């Protein structure tokens, strides 16, 4: 009802590819928008989406307090919210990822009544993922502040993934142009010599900012971020990642009570999933076409979909409403406003499709968009 | 050296 | 050199508006994609964007080992890139993210000589941080699979989120097209009893799949977890949020070493920047306009970008072709192999874009693009 | 009631 919306967006770490169909789309139809963003290429892009944009990092300045900045970039975005605009903050990667202003200004514009929504984005974690080739799900991951990490003494696990963010900036409370020194450096390389040992690996990753750059994918023991000519290599945009020491055994207690048994089938803890994690210390090679993996793969001459398998059929007019949901704020703001309304005013929807849209139930779209089989209702646990 | 910090932690920023 | 590539890229979570825009580009470059997404909508905007698409769920089947289907998914990429084709393999949220078959298809192709990339994409962790308005950087992140965080005994810490996927199938190794009863749920809601307290809270997220649909944010205590109508609520989509329980106090020592001094101005561990997490049990409000807020932004009149700020100062035809760069793949692919050739055939590059895009230098383009002062190159760390 | 399990871990999955 209210008159005002913020909504905060990502842009990705590589510059303009890595922004979500959404994010863009709130760009374009935002009154009013500002950003911080670390490429020009990125920053040229939003410029050419919309004509009212304001560049939040002419709020940084030599020696002035990051707090103060952060709270100037977050009141300059709710006071376009307070006269009634919808506005849109722009911040690179995922908005919310390692950013104060973001969430500072969402909170106060929630508290006085106003629309208020972080769209997610791809962060500087996410690319780490994707180009050091690891999933946090195996085995776990940790993820700090680099000044945090220090200064609370986070807990290490030596069996999960370790990721510090901002580590170029350990202890520092302010800004300045030109970056920083990073003098307290050699406190974080102590602490991560009492977790992991001189001789342990840690990747300095810096994830591409221009599609045509590779990222640094740089291996060095903690011993070697010593060395002068290596910690002058940590800036900004530096992350690092620390590989696990060692493999977690399995707990008998919940291998019976999760009846995975007999125990004695269970694998050794050094029993990998092809592909093994290439970053950690004396990583055994592990076979892609076990024999099991070969059965699989004869298994595919005779494959066809199973009896429950739900194909895809829907029609042009159902897929393009669903996009222009997805991709025009002003479809979706009409359509969430009067379901009714908005459908029955979609052409060339089958009486289905318009039935689905007036409900508005995600299990209602859902077969008016895929064949349910016979075979999959008589077992279905969606009770209708 | 892009420097586009955006987040500090309680007892460094202020 | 080698024929054929490999690109897996996701479409993040809510259906369409959360893939990125170089997912896209190279879903419709690809000569052939393969697959594995959960909402109809995502699977029919697929389709109109490549006319050669498999779907990998109908390598799913009841009682089928998912190893079996990974192992499956992955060779039907790969024997494509083996015949020379550019593949792209398409997964939800983020294709490295809690997937196998990305991880194994990828490092069977980069071991066979192929060309192998992962794009990052946004993860439903991802959708947390933005729907559960957290940061991970405040108080740190851990993430773990919920069966792994049983059977590994993964350590859990108070102070820090704790995220925990695939809480609907804890001991589950097959498939069923109608779901799991989930009947192991039990022993997972015995740990977090064990590690916080019957009190403490659970957030049960599920991020909006559809465009329109609001995400569920429910707050249990872990006692309610034993509740079989609440236990009922968890599904195939369902993630766990835990707040922290306690906040940590500061190190004196690397408090001393970062010279965080006078120690007596260190806020107290109670201390919080605004705004609070609103999760966390007897969370004490935070005022968002304290003193030093409120000066802060009275400095907003007065303000001017300062001297060292470096304004956007570019032109269409550099704005274009960057742009082109990061939304083509050939025409990546084309600069990739020759700058010089590619430069000297862009129309309408000034001399120092030409000379810029000739080199690829990150740091040549950027001084095309902004405006560097003599006060910012005075100072400037750049030795050169 | 999506059922979009890519992923399984070593003890449970084989
Ligand atoms: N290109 C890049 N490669 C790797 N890490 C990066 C990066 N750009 C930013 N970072 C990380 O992010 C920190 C800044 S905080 C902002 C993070 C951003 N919101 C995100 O979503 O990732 C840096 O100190 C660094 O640790
Ligand atoms: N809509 C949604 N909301 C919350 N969690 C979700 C979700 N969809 C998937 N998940 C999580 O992801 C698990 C499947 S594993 C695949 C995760 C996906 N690659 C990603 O990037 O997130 C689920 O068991 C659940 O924990």
């Not at chain 1, 410029?47 to 990051?66: A, F, I, P």
């Not at chain 1, 629309?115 to 690891?134: K, Q, T």
């Not at chain 1, 991951?141 to 000044?147: D, K, R």
């Not at chain 1, 459908?343 to 508005?360: I, K």
Request: net charge negative.
């Amino acid at each position: 009802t209210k008159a005002g919306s913020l909504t905060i967006v990502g842009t990705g770490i590589e510059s303009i590819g890595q922004m979500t169909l959404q994010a863009l789309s709130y760009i374009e139809a935002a009154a009013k928008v500002f950003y911080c963003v670390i490429d020009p290429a990125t920053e040229a892009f939003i410029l050419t989406k919309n004509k009212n944009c304001v560049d939040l990092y002419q709020y940084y300045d030599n020696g002035k307090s990051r707090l103060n900045t952060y709270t100037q970039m977050s009141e300059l975005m709710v006071r376009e919210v307070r006269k009634g605009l919808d506005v849109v903050g722009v911040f690179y990667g995922h908005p919310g990822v390692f950013v104060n202003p973001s969430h500072r200004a969402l909170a106060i514009a929630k508290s006085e009544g106003y629309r208020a929504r972080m769209l997610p984005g791809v962060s500087a974690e996410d690319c780490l993922f994707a180009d050091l080739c690891i999933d946090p799900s195996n085995p776990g991951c940790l993820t700090y502040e680099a000044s945090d990490f220090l200064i609370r003494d986070r807990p290490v696990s030596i069996h999960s993934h370790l990721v510090l963010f901002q580590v170029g900036c350990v202890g520092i409370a302010d800004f300045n142009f030109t970056g920083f020194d990073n003098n307290k450096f050699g406190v974080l390389v102590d602490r991560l010599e009492q977790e992991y040992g001189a001789e342990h690996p840690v990747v300095h990753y810096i994830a591409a900012m221009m599609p045509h750059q590779d990222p640094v994918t740089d291996k060095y023991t903690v011993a070697q971020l010593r060395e002068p000519e290596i910690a002058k290599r940590v800036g900004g945009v530096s992350t690092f990642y620390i590989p696990p020491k060692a493999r977690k055994a399995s707990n008998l207690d919940i291998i019976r009570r999760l009846e995975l048994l007999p125990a004695g089938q269970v694998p050794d803890k050094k029993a990998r999933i092809y592909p093994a994690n290439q970053w950690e210390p004396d990583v055994p090679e592990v076979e892609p076409y076990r024999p099991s993996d070969q059965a699989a793969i004869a298994q595919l001459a005779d494959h066809a979909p199973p009896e429950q398998y739900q194909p895809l059929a829907t029609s042009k007019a159902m897929s393009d409403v669903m996009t222009k949901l997805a991709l025009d704020p002003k479809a979706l703001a009409d359509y969430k406003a009067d379901h009714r309304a908005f459908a029955q005013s979609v052409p060339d929807l089958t009486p289905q499709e318009r039935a689905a849209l007036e409900l508005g139930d995600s299990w209602a779209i859902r077969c008016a968009m895929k064949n349910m089989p016979s075979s999959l209702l008589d077992a279905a646990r969606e009770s209708g | 050296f892009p420097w586009v910090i955006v987040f500090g932690v309680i007892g460094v920023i202020g």
